[PDB]
Design an enzyme around this catalytic site. Structure first.
Site, PDB file in Angstrom:
ATOM      1  N   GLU D  39      -4.618  -7.920  -2.856  1.00 18.23           N
ATOM      2  CA  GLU D  39      -3.910  -8.533  -4.221  1.00 18.23           C
ATOM      3  C   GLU D  39      -4.267  -9.912  -4.511  1.00 18.23           C
ATOM      4  O   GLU D  39      -4.557 -10.271  -5.542  1.00 18.23           O
ATOM      5  CB  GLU D  39      -2.546  -7.899  -4.104  1.00 18.23           C
ATOM      6  CG  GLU D  39      -2.213  -6.678  -3.854  1.00 18.23           C
ATOM      7  CD  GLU D  39      -0.918  -6.012  -4.034  1.00 18.23           C
ATOM      8  OE1 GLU D  39      -0.036  -6.541  -4.836  1.00 18.23           O
ATOM      9  OE2 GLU D  39      -0.317  -5.200  -2.905  1.00 18.23           O
ATOM     10  N   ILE D  85       6.658 -27.142  -3.195  1.00 16.90           N
ATOM     11  CA  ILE D  85       5.924 -27.786  -2.044  1.00 16.90           C
ATOM     12  C   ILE D  85       6.060 -26.839  -0.851  1.00 16.90           C
ATOM     13  O   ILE D  85       7.366 -26.485  -0.643  1.00 16.90           O
ATOM     14  CB  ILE D  85       6.408 -29.130  -1.807  1.00 16.90           C
ATOM     15  CG1 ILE D  85       5.601 -29.756  -0.533  1.00 16.90           C
ATOM     16  CG2 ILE D  85       7.850 -29.248  -1.568  1.00 16.90           C
ATOM     17  CD1 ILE D  85       5.464 -31.250  -0.376  1.00 16.90           C
ATOM     18  N   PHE D  96       5.886 -35.637   6.208  1.00 19.05           N
ATOM     19  CA  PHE D  96       4.802 -35.682   4.886  1.00 19.05           C
ATOM     20  C   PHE D  96       5.361 -35.235   3.963  1.00 19.05           C
ATOM     21  O   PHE D  96       4.738 -35.639   2.501  1.00 19.05           O
ATOM     22  CB  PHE D  96       3.718 -34.515   5.365  1.00 19.05           C
ATOM     23  CG  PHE D  96       2.993 -34.891   6.753  1.00 19.05           C
ATOM     24  CD1 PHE D  96       2.318 -33.882   7.515  1.00 19.05           C
ATOM     25  CD2 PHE D  96       2.718 -36.161   6.809  1.00 19.05           C
ATOM     26  CE1 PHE D  96       1.819 -34.263   8.760  1.00 19.05           C
ATOM     27  CE2 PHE D  96       2.012 -36.469   8.104  1.00 19.05           C
ATOM     28  CZ  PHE D  96       1.581 -35.461   9.059  1.00 19.05           C
ATOM     29  N   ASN D 125      20.814 -26.428   1.150  1.00 18.91           N
ATOM     30  CA  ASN D 125      19.871 -27.429   2.042  1.00 18.91           C
ATOM     31  C   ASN D 125      19.949 -28.963   1.085  1.00 18.91           C
ATOM     32  O   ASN D 125      19.175 -29.167   0.299  1.00 18.91           O
ATOM     33  CB  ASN D 125      18.310 -26.799   2.151  1.00 18.91           C
ATOM     34  CG  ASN D 125      17.649 -27.935   2.799  1.00 18.91           C
ATOM     35  OD1 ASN D 125      18.135 -29.181   3.255  1.00 18.91           O
ATOM     36  ND2 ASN D 125      16.326 -27.728   2.629  1.00 18.91           N
ATOM     37  N   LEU D 131      16.283 -35.856  -0.449  1.00 13.64           N
ATOM     38  CA  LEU D 131      14.768 -36.291  -0.507  1.00 13.64           C
ATOM     39  C   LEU D 131      14.268 -36.537  -1.962  1.00 13.64           C
ATOM     40  O   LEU D 131      13.566 -37.176  -2.512  1.00 13.64           O
ATOM     41  CB  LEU D 131      13.911 -35.512   0.379  1.00 13.64           C
ATOM     42  CG  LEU D 131      12.655 -35.862   0.646  1.00 13.64           C
ATOM     43  CD1 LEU D 131      12.093 -35.686   2.030  1.00 13.64           C
ATOM     44  CD2 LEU D 131      11.635 -35.367  -0.444  1.00 13.64           C
ATOM     45  N   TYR D 132      14.637 -35.258  -2.685  1.00 15.95           N
ATOM     46  CA  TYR D 132      14.038 -35.147  -4.149  1.00 15.95           C
ATOM     47  C   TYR D 132      14.771 -36.389  -4.864  1.00 15.95           C
ATOM     48  O   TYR D 132      14.218 -37.045  -5.727  1.00 15.95           O
ATOM     49  CB  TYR D 132      14.297 -33.853  -4.712  1.00 15.95           C
ATOM     50  CG  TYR D 132      13.506 -32.775  -4.073  1.00 15.95           C
ATOM     51  CD1 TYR D 132      12.347 -32.826  -3.944  1.00 15.95           C
ATOM     52  CD2 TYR D 132      14.259 -31.572  -3.512  1.00 15.95           C
ATOM     53  CE1 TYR D 132      11.502 -31.900  -3.314  1.00 15.95           C
ATOM     54  CE2 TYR D 132      13.591 -30.543  -3.035  1.00 15.95           C
ATOM     55  CZ  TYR D 132      12.106 -30.695  -2.780  1.00 15.95           C
ATOM     56  OH  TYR D 132      11.392 -29.710  -2.321  1.00 15.95           O
ATOM     57  N   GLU D 134      15.997 -39.226  -3.848  1.00 15.19           N
ATOM     58  CA  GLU D 134      15.251 -40.461  -3.541  1.00 15.19           C
ATOM     59  C   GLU D 134      13.807 -40.619  -4.317  1.00 15.19           C
ATOM     60  O   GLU D 134      13.482 -41.729  -4.804  1.00 15.19           O
ATOM     61  CB  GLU D 134      15.030 -40.336  -2.157  1.00 15.19           C
ATOM     62  CG  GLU D 134      16.112 -40.828  -1.158  1.00 15.19           C
ATOM     63  CD  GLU D 134      15.954 -40.602   0.177  1.00 15.19           C
ATOM     64  OE1 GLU D 134      14.767 -40.236   0.813  1.00 15.19           O
ATOM     65  OE2 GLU D 134      16.595 -41.524   0.980  1.00 15.19           O
TER      66      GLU D 134
END
Lengths: 166, 166, 168, 168, 164, 167, 168, 168, 166, 166, 166, 166
Positions: D39, D85, D96, D125, D131-132, D134
């Site tokens: 698929e 991501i 990373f 989370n 992190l986002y 930042e």
């Protein structure tokens, strides 16, 4: 009475001849139970010659019945014959004439060698008049068809081009 | 009562019948909600024998209901029965005769072995009616279908060809 | 009542097209842009059987088409769907919006068995925001410059309702 | 550093398919469900030229595939897109994520000329949320019971960033 | 018990063909592998039925799980479990059933999972019951199997009972 | 008081007739065409393509007044070439200004484009003055760019930005 | 001298791809976007016999691939075409640009019988502008905010040269 | 037995075509005449999902085809079907017919749930009639000049067997 | 008099005109004879610009002639011009206007450099006609074409864009 | 010297020759410039007889040149002839022998009535060579081809089957 | 020698055999002149039963000729026979056996009644061969066919099923 | 009497003409019996010139008969002629005039070389008619067709343009 090649406008008479829920009907070996899918099957097999049908009508052009030559094989020159007389015109002595007109077409135009038919064992009058027309029993097929809630036996009876012409 | 095969012209009727009782309708296990989608699904499955449908019209020639045979398996010889009568023509005693006519067709023409159906446990009158026609409970499906904002249980009831004929 | 919701038909497509001519908006049909009626009709016939989106035209008592109800971005795993409602200016302000919203929710929560229904409403249209709040919706986001409307990036309120609140 | 972003290829489809074997989620390809590699392969060949979504495989200097960077739901009228991501299980935890997120924003705002990049991060989370934050993102919504993940409807944070903030 | 599920791919069709009975594929009869392969490529994108093969550590196929008659409005599905005769009796049935229930109730978000089990196979009934199934129907002469109409127990399990 | 409607197959013939009065070599999505049958096939081929957008203008009586075309659309650079063609019947009644503004309005308020440029023959200064009054500015004098009516002719490339139109 | 222009082959598509990625920018093939090699190869197969665009690889005497010469937007009624030159950084600054430009003009004015060859060059790159001037190009336009490069709209000069000037 | 009955495949077509060449006949495929192999292959591709006929090849331990078993005129309402069996002359007479016939009846009466299985056998072959009679079949018709074989109209015995008799 | 690009509705005109006036009929250099073959070739080469054809229709839209630009080369900017007026409207002076309208379209729209044509040497009337229209003899091909069962010479005559425009 | 029918393996030789001549190549009147374009065009016109090509090889079977017959018209029995000799074997007097071989094959096997060719007016060497071979000028085409940046006139010269045979 | 129904791989054989033995061959009464056109015609008339072809081959698997039964009529049971042997295998005495094999297939398998053939009278060797195989003259057609540039009288000979079988 | 090409509106007339003779009819060598399949075949071979039919109508445009030129082989310049006349307009002497008109159209406009026909041996009056018209017997086909239940022989009579024109 006169026979005529079946036309599209005659399809509705076919659908009314044998009402649904009483006979599992086929058209060129394809099941059908409605007029719209019958019309599509007619359009799909308009040129197929494996089965040929003719409508019979009187001087007043009142459709009286149908004659069907099915399972036509042009190598063995055999074909199954079926005759369906309308209920309103049944019992008027047309059976023999329609059968002879079908055998005439089969043996004098199509040039067929054998014409067989299946007749219900539980209809001896039909068997007798077919024998009078020139047919001979060649088989007693046991429980061939499930009709009206019962597996029924059928007499397979045949006639040859030689007998009819001579 | 008259039980005829479904035609393209009758599509607008069953569609209007389906909008009177809120249902997620399926045509040959394909969801549909618009009339155009229904019409194209009818044209796609016009020759599919997996489901057979018959309209019900009264003596006045008015269409009043629908009878559906679905999930037809010709190896196991089983089918699911469904009946729908417009609210106007309910309570007049038609459901019983139409069920008998459907069972007659399934056991005398199609040569089927089993006919099962689902009925809402919350509709006990229908359960008793089906029981009076020969159906027997074989299952109590829990939260089978989400109907009218709630998961409802449905009784699966079956009838066999042997009992009907004999 | 006075209103009936009917599944969308091909004959109704041109009415949909005319609505988009009154309300200047870059229109989509099953996540594919369209602006000509031929492009619309070809996209309609392409997704005739696609259940990712469901549209219902609204006709009044006199069988006059007054608006549209779109359930787009339907997801049958997460059981969510984005609701949108358009009403012709002629029949706007006649108290239909609330009834149509309730009918759409009824279809989503009693027939399709969905879990959540969200929508986007411009911040610059507080009347609509209040109307959705009255119908049960609650703000879950204030998307900043989410769309470009009438020459400016505009913020929109993402408001939601859940099956549990509507049925219980 | 040393990480390289490269446009997705047909040969990479088995890496993508392998990433989601260890991820228990209902996968999509151009808004179309897929489960088997067959698929996925037919969907790739179906949307080989579709620009509604973009994908970049991330690999090391040793050409070891480490993750994926997706820009889906791209709209060229509103100039928005959803970022996503994924980092392979064998390469996550090395730091990373931040550099790849910045490389995604760079591509979105310096080449595609997009105006807004949003994302969804689970409310369970807050480390990713930070992190986002930042990297420039800020919360624009708390979507309630948006998705059904691992046997429970989970809430998510919709976070956005604009072209001006990233370029200035 | 480190068995892993994987989506069915064309490479696995031959295995399913070698695994008499009147088989179906998306409710279409098939007898030959060519007939099966054309049906597979036909329903490659159809979600009315979902299938997954279970393999061990060294990538050895041992069984197949089928979800058929999937209804996304009522959120139900018929579950069928097949185990290779070579791995039968090794104690994997329980794991396969619970992994199928886990996928149905944690990813697909289905509400009910039902299955048919031959009345003449009470060990399978007991095993399903241990897995959390409860009888909801005793279908009489539902299937013509090996020359005789056989009754089958219809047994279900709900998303709530499994998750809680 | 005119209306602009997305082009539909029924209007194709009108476009063909327009190109019969304006002697030019016409393209459809950058593919040559001269026969209505070739035009109709190209229309059906590029019906969902968005590299070019065309709108026919009608009056109160729904009589066709002309055409506006946005071609060479680039959604990365947010540019597009504009071309307006008004029939000789309704040429000179003052409709040009309105349709040029309506095209700019659609481009900058709905499509969210950045730049709209157009080519105009140097030998047609009235059109240059018109576009300049509508907000366009010369950014080029392309020398012998097109072979028009038996001669290589220069054309002014004139542009307008979204900022100026919206501020 | 020593530089040879060859017709593009499928085997050269990798060189083009890598070369285009070294100068990151939205790539087009016959005015159709592409980013991945698999997409480039499928576009090459599609337009293998299309004459709207003609490309030529540059090779050294050792068959070392130097750069690419593109003639796009070729019109065989107006007899125009847009020229583009892309030399590999490892071979830049060696004077190859002048010779390759002259070779492209020679082919376009002596073989194809074209009338005009125009090009776009960044205003902010004055060295390239004076190079094209030395090759015969003359400014005919100052396109304002035409392209979006590295997060900023840039103005570009449109420069042209005619067949009569080159041949005489 | 080490004789396997396998559903017919594409690769088996060229075997039955050679087997039909060895026994000169006017062959049919779903009631359609065919003579060449290419015509047979097109007919196979046409009737690959048609359940009106079911064909099974016979192969020995060495995995080489030897025979064919055909079920034609399959009526799923009357539950009838015509049975035919062909065995290569080289492998004929080795007592395989009885085993194959019983296996065919087993599949017809235990899997397909058919009611009657009938066949036609030439009167001039009394050994075949005896074998069929020992397998459970019983004569029900003596068709006179039914088929034209080897230049003469030959009579054939139509013999049948019922599901009840076979199962009990 | 209007010059219109050839459309499918004109195929049955040129076909008859090609049979009445015995012409070696090719469509984009692929010979045919049947009408369906013509229609298929038209559909195959609808976007092909190697040959351009234009019918000529009067005010009442009666097809009078055909203008064919063939062997078109966009590198050398040349093309072979063929004119064919139907016998019905022959001798009415249309030939000169149509030749000039074709030259105008070739030199002012397509920007072609040279238009050449072949004329039977035994038809000096047509030769002088083309000479008046601006063409000039450039070759005397010897026994070039087989016409009426006889190899005949044909004059090749040309006209240049600079001459027509200046 | 031997002339052999052209095959796939020879394509890379044809292409190479064309890279040494600054000519706008064609294959069955289809522009090409890359080997891949040439290969696809070759496989597209593999069974087309509108053009016939034969490679020229020496005794050692080294590739020497190529002869092309294009615009082959079997109704008029004409064909254009083109000859190419590799730069390594130029100046050795092979062109004369190869032209003779080509004319022999054309007039003997193909049974062609005329073989014509075009030669640049500004290349009198080739004109003199073809004159020695038997060709005679039949046309002075003005500005027929754009060559090396300038429109050049070309001599069209022919040779008939009669002259070569008798 | 063995006979095998013609297949696609044999198309290049009959084509090279119809050009060697010059003939404006029709495929199911359809003009053709190219190999690709023959291939399209084969796949177009692959299921047509009006004509049946059989390629004859050697034990070494080398094809030697073709046998065609055209104009097959299943009502009158007539069919025209034709046989074309390759020049290399002529004179080997094969024609007689191949004629008998075709008659066997026509009278013992297809159940045909009459088999007629047209043979050039100027080829008496074939006529006598047919007379030996049982054929008898029934018509002397005058200038029926055009062979070698001349109208030649042909002989229509026939044979019936009874003679061959009895 | 005037002869006019066949139009679709005339198909019904042809169908009625076939009612007089009870033989299996063919349209472009395709079997047909009903009017629907006749119209389908007419629309199928509308452009096929292999068979040409012309209807006959008197001064008042009243249909009289039909003239068919079938089995037209343009390579051999042959054609089978057939003429039918409605029973209401037989014996009027139209036979000779129509046969001469048909032969004139065949030998002057179509430029055919031979015209043959098949006439029943048991109908000598028609044989004499065709003999007077100019035809002569070239064959006595034995048991060619199956008519009225018997294989019947037919005379093949021909006439050459060398005799008619001179």
């Amino acid at each position: 009475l006169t026979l005529r090649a079946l036309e599209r406008g005659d399809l509705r008479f076919i659908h009314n001849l044998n009402k649904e829920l009483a006979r599992y009907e086929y058209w060129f070996e394809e099941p059908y139970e409605s007029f719209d899918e019958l019309e599509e099957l007619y359009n799909k097999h308009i040129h197929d010659n494996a089965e040929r049908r003719f409508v019979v009508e009187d001087a007043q052009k009142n459709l009286i019945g149908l004659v069907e030559l099915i399972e036509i094989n042009y190598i063995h020159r055999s074909a199954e014959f079926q005759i369906i007389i309308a209920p309103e015109h049944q019992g008027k002595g047309f059976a023999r004439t329609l059968i002879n007109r079908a055998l005439d077409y089969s043996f004098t135009i199509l040039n067929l060698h054998k014409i067989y038919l299946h007749v219900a064992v539980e209809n001896p009058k039909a068997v007798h008049l077919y024998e009078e027309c020139g047919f001979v029993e060649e088989g007693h097929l046991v429980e061939e068809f499930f009709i009206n809630g019962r597996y029924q036996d059928v007499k397979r009876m045949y006639i040859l081009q030689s007998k009819y012409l001579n």
